[PDB]
Amino acid sequence: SVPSWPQILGRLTDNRDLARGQAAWAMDQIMTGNARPAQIAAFAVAMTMKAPTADEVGELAGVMLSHAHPLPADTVPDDAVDVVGTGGDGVNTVNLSTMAAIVVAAAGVPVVKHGNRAASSLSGGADTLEALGVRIDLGPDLVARSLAEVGIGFCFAPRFHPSYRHAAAVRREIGVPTVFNLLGPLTNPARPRAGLIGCAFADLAEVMAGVFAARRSSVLVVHGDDGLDELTTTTTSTIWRVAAGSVDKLTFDPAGFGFARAQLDQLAGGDAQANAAAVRAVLGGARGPVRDAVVLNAAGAIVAHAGLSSRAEWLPAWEEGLRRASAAIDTGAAEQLLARWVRFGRQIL
Amino acid sequence: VPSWPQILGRLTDNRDLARGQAAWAMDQIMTGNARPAQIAAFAVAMTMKAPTADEVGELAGVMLSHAHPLPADTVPDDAVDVVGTGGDGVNTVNLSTMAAIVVAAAGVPVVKHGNRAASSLSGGADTLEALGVRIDLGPDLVARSLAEVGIGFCFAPRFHPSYRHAAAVRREIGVPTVFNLLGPLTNPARPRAGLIGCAFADLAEVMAGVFAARRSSVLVVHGDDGLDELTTTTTSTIWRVAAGSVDKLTFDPAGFGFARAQLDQLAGDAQANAAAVRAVLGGARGPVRDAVVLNAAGAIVAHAGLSSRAEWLPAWEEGLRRASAAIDTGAAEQLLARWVRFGRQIL
Ligand SMILES: [Mg+2]
């Protein structure tokens, strides 16, 4: 049974899980430039509607990572974290994960994010950072220095995943969310072993938790029960607590921590300059549902970070994560870290 | 307002499309405005969602609107098609091609529709070319072929030029999709009757729905062993279509004295298919002949359903008689010879 597109696509459209190595073969065809756009699209859609398994996604992400540019050896702290969403919920939110990232870094946890400029005028993470004066497109050496000197870094996806460009193009062409939406968080080229990961779909969030569990990562995979790939105060959330290769599925109610119920339109995004203004507001200590969501996201990442070296009780872990996140803001540390981050970028010249 | 993200999104959510959306998608594909990735995504998503009769009807309809028709009043009102949708894991071109010749030799006008296969494994057109038949004829010559020989063949790339972008994507992915269903439903001669085989029972029912809305007289057939023809291996399900209604029934050729056969006995290669044609039309008995006679009769029963009031059972007995006779009296062999001779005398 030598792999082929008819064999693999046939299996998927028959609603069957793939044999071992088939997903990996598919990805190696995609990453070497040998997959036609039609084959990429067909595979992406087929994989999605069949329902991908943890093993299948692990093969995809593993092959993708092998093609990626690494950060220099021994430069990424062992306890570095990611804060990121898979997108594909159809809800344009303000850049909560990016704000949370700055807060988490300010609380003493190394953060390395990973992404690209958004195709549409809707400002994504990378676009907002650039609007804030951050240099997002840096080589491996400079990201390493950024992590060392500032405590935070950003891996620009096109630079670190150049062989993924064919796949990325197809993604834009078809528009619909697919299995490939899961690969972003699973192919952070800095390879953090912890993070707060948002996912737009309940079924896929569990698949992701399985992949992270297989890597023995310490992660919280979060799903807004209203369908958001974000952690917010608008409603309750399902959180998969991944640590020690073990996975606990928990419900999470922000009201239990005293947060008020916010409306979803209060978290709506805009253009880059608007989202930049929102970042400055939160880091400036402004109260409201945005800060609340940022503090939740930051605390989540901090709980995941703690999961690397211990396994504390859930609620007291969160209470301390929330405190550290709140402190990081109100001491001015988070605002100060963004400034040091901007400063580091200016020093490069 | 329709868009690919909207339509693809609806399909991936396992939802039927709104009326007109399938048509929009197909029009984009046929006008060269669809990207290969979008074509592929749509094909695969529609397949795994499971298309409805309304959806396939829009796809077939749009495709036909871009097709070259045959000249006015050159297709007999009672012309038939004989074909399967393939995408079965096996192949069936041998039977459909042979049955079509037998049907034409029984006195029923036949107009088939197909293309050359990329693989060495024959498509409908490849076997005919191996027998000396000239497959790539324009509308005028196909019409004269129908008039003078009693049979004709519409070469898809010539009658469906706008379909080329879809065809290319189809080859690249290889896997069967909803597009496999379109062949029988986009015959540019637009025959009103026929014997249509389908590899999957759920899709056979859908095809039957589309034909019903056309007021065609068609037998949509599915071998319960998975064959996209009437099989002798076991029973078949037939969606009997006429006057806008569908009569679904279990069919057993044993009731007509056919011995049970093995699947392997019904093969293949283009050159090997041609040898099978020669053998059968020459009078060789066996499972292959039986399957040909059975499906030929089926097309004749469908043909009768147009303007004859003959009931199912006697129509089949007559159909079987005419099919066997068309072979045993050499009429089928003689018709193939006349078909080849027709093509030779042009250039
Ligand atoms: Mg989001």
Short mmCIF file of N, CA, C and O in Angstrom, two decimals, chain B residues 80 82-83 92-106 110 112 151 195 229 277 280-281 288 291-300 323 326-327 332:
data_model
loop_
_atom_site.label_atom_id
_atom_site.label_comp_id
_atom_site.label_asym_id
_atom_site.label_seq_id
_atom_site.Cartn_x
_atom_site.Cartn_y
_atom_site.Cartn_z
N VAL B 80 -32.21 6.48 -26.58
CA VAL B 80 -31.85 6.06 -25.22
C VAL B 80 -30.35 6.19 -24.95
O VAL B 80 -29.55 6.27 -25.87
N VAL B 82 -27.21 4.31 -22.45
CA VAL B 82 -26.87 3.12 -21.68
C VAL B 82 -25.50 3.32 -21.06
O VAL B 82 -24.49 3.31 -21.76
N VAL B 83 -25.45 3.52 -19.74
CA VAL B 83 -24.21 3.93 -19.09
C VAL B 83 -24.26 3.81 -17.57
O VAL B 83 -25.34 3.84 -16.97
N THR B 92 -16.94 -1.19 -15.55
CA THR B 92 -18.18 -1.68 -16.12
C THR B 92 -18.36 -1.28 -17.59
O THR B 92 -19.39 -1.58 -18.19
N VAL B 93 -17.37 -0.60 -18.14
CA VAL B 93 -17.45 -0.06 -19.49
C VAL B 93 -17.74 -1.15 -20.52
O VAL B 93 -18.46 -0.92 -21.49
N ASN B 94 -17.19 -2.33 -20.30
CA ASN B 94 -17.43 -3.47 -21.17
C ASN B 94 -18.92 -3.74 -21.37
O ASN B 94 -19.39 -3.90 -22.50
N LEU B 95 -19.67 -3.78 -20.27
CA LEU B 95 -21.09 -4.11 -20.32
C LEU B 95 -21.92 -3.01 -20.97
O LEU B 95 -22.75 -3.28 -21.84
N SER B 96 -21.70 -1.77 -20.56
CA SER B 96 -22.49 -0.64 -21.06
C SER B 96 -22.27 -0.43 -22.55
O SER B 96 -23.21 -0.14 -23.29
N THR B 97 -21.02 -0.57 -22.99
CA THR B 97 -20.69 -0.40 -24.40
C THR B 97 -21.32 -1.51 -25.24
O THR B 97 -21.86 -1.26 -26.32
N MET B 98 -21.25 -2.74 -24.74
CA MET B 98 -21.81 -3.88 -25.44
C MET B 98 -23.33 -3.81 -25.49
O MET B 98 -23.94 -4.06 -26.53
N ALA B 99 -23.95 -3.46 -24.37
CA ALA B 99 -25.40 -3.36 -24.29
C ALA B 99 -25.93 -2.31 -25.26
O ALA B 99 -26.95 -2.51 -25.91
N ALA B 100 -25.22 -1.19 -25.35
CA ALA B 100 -25.61 -0.10 -26.23
C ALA B 100 -25.68 -0.55 -27.69
O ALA B 100 -26.59 -0.18 -28.43
N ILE B 101 -24.71 -1.36 -28.10
CA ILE B 101 -24.67 -1.88 -29.46
C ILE B 101 -25.83 -2.84 -29.69
O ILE B 101 -26.50 -2.79 -30.72
N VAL B 102 -26.07 -3.72 -28.72
CA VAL B 102 -27.18 -4.67 -28.79
C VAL B 102 -28.52 -3.95 -28.86
O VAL B 102 -29.40 -4.33 -29.64
N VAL B 103 -28.69 -2.92 -28.04
CA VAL B 103 -29.92 -2.14 -28.03
C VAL B 103 -30.16 -1.51 -29.40
O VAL B 103 -31.27 -1.58 -29.94
N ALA B 104 -29.13 -0.89 -29.95
CA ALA B 104 -29.22 -0.27 -31.27
C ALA B 104 -29.57 -1.31 -32.33
O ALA B 104 -30.30 -1.02 -33.28
N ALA B 105 -29.06 -2.52 -32.16
CA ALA B 105 -29.30 -3.61 -33.11
C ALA B 105 -30.71 -4.18 -32.96
O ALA B 105 -31.20 -4.89 -33.84
N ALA B 106 -31.37 -3.87 -31.84
CA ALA B 106 -32.74 -4.30 -31.62
C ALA B 106 -33.73 -3.31 -32.24
O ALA B 106 -34.93 -3.58 -32.28
N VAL B 110 -29.74 4.74 -30.11
CA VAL B 110 -28.87 4.93 -28.95
C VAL B 110 -27.91 6.09 -29.19
O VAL B 110 -27.33 6.21 -30.26
N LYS B 112 -24.73 7.60 -26.96
CA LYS B 112 -23.91 7.52 -25.76
C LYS B 112 -23.05 8.77 -25.60
O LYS B 112 -22.98 9.62 -26.49
N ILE B 151 -26.92 4.55 -34.11
CA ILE B 151 -26.18 4.81 -32.88
C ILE B 151 -25.22 5.97 -33.07
O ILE B 151 -24.76 6.24 -34.18
N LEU B 195 -30.86 3.33 -19.61
CA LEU B 195 -30.50 2.45 -18.51
C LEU B 195 -29.27 3.05 -17.83
O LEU B 195 -28.19 3.06 -18.41
N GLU B 229 -24.31 -1.65 -12.71
CA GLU B 229 -25.11 -2.20 -13.80
C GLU B 229 -26.07 -3.19 -13.17
O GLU B 229 -25.98 -3.47 -11.98
N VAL B 277 -15.96 -7.68 -26.43
CA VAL B 277 -17.01 -7.24 -27.35
C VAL B 277 -17.10 -8.18 -28.55
O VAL B 277 -18.18 -8.66 -28.89
N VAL B 280 -18.57 -11.65 -27.42
CA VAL B 280 -19.99 -11.61 -27.09
C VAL B 280 -20.86 -11.41 -28.33
O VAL B 280 -21.81 -12.15 -28.56
N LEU B 281 -20.52 -10.41 -29.14
CA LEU B 281 -21.30 -10.11 -30.34
C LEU B 281 -21.18 -11.24 -31.36
O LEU B 281 -21.99 -11.33 -32.29
N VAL B 288 -20.79 -12.88 -18.96
CA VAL B 288 -20.67 -11.57 -19.60
C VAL B 288 -21.82 -11.33 -20.58
O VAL B 288 -22.42 -10.25 -20.59
N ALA B 291 -25.06 -10.63 -18.62
CA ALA B 291 -25.12 -9.29 -18.07
C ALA B 291 -25.44 -8.27 -19.16
O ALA B 291 -26.19 -7.32 -18.93
N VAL B 292 -24.89 -8.48 -20.35
CA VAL B 292 -25.13 -7.59 -21.48
C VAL B 292 -26.59 -7.68 -21.91
O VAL B 292 -27.26 -6.66 -22.10
N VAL B 293 -27.09 -8.90 -22.08
CA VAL B 293 -28.48 -9.13 -22.45
C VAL B 293 -29.41 -8.51 -21.41
O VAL B 293 -30.45 -7.95 -21.75
N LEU B 294 -29.03 -8.63 -20.14
CA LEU B 294 -29.86 -8.16 -19.05
C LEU B 294 -30.00 -6.64 -19.05
O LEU B 294 -31.10 -6.11 -18.89
N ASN B 295 -28.88 -5.94 -19.23
CA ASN B 295 -28.88 -4.48 -19.24
C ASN B 295 -29.42 -3.91 -20.54
O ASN B 295 -30.03 -2.84 -20.55
N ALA B 296 -29.19 -4.61 -21.64
CA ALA B 296 -29.75 -4.22 -22.93
C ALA B 296 -31.27 -4.26 -22.86
O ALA B 296 -31.95 -3.33 -23.29
N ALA B 297 -31.80 -5.35 -22.32
CA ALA B 297 -33.23 -5.51 -22.11
C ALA B 297 -33.76 -4.38 -21.24
O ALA B 297 -34.83 -3.84 -21.50
N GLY B 298 -33.01 -4.04 -20.20
CA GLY B 298 -33.38 -2.97 -19.30
C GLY B 298 -33.57 -1.64 -20.01
O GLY B 298 -34.52 -0.91 -19.73
N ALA B 299 -32.67 -1.34 -20.94
CA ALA B 299 -32.77 -0.11 -21.72
C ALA B 299 -33.98 -0.15 -22.64
O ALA B 299 -34.61 0.86 -22.90
N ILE B 300 -34.29 -1.35 -23.14
CA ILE B 300 -35.44 -1.53 -24.02
C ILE B 300 -36.74 -1.37 -23.24
O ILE B 300 -37.72 -0.83 -23.75
N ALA B 323 -33.11 -8.60 -27.09
CA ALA B 323 -31.69 -8.43 -26.83
C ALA B 323 -30.91 -9.68 -27.23
O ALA B 323 -29.88 -9.59 -27.90
N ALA B 326 -30.91 -9.96 -31.01
CA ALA B 326 -30.01 -8.99 -31.64
C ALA B 326 -28.59 -9.53 -31.68
O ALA B 326 -27.82 -9.22 -32.59
N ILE B 327 -28.24 -10.35 -30.69
CA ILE B 327 -26.93 -11.00 -30.64
C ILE B 327 -26.91 -12.24 -31.53
O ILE B 327 -26.04 -12.39 -32.39
N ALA B 332 -26.22 -7.41 -33.96
CA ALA B 332 -25.35 -6.57 -33.14
C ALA B 332 -23.96 -6.50 -33.76
O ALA B 332 -23.37 -5.43 -33.88
#
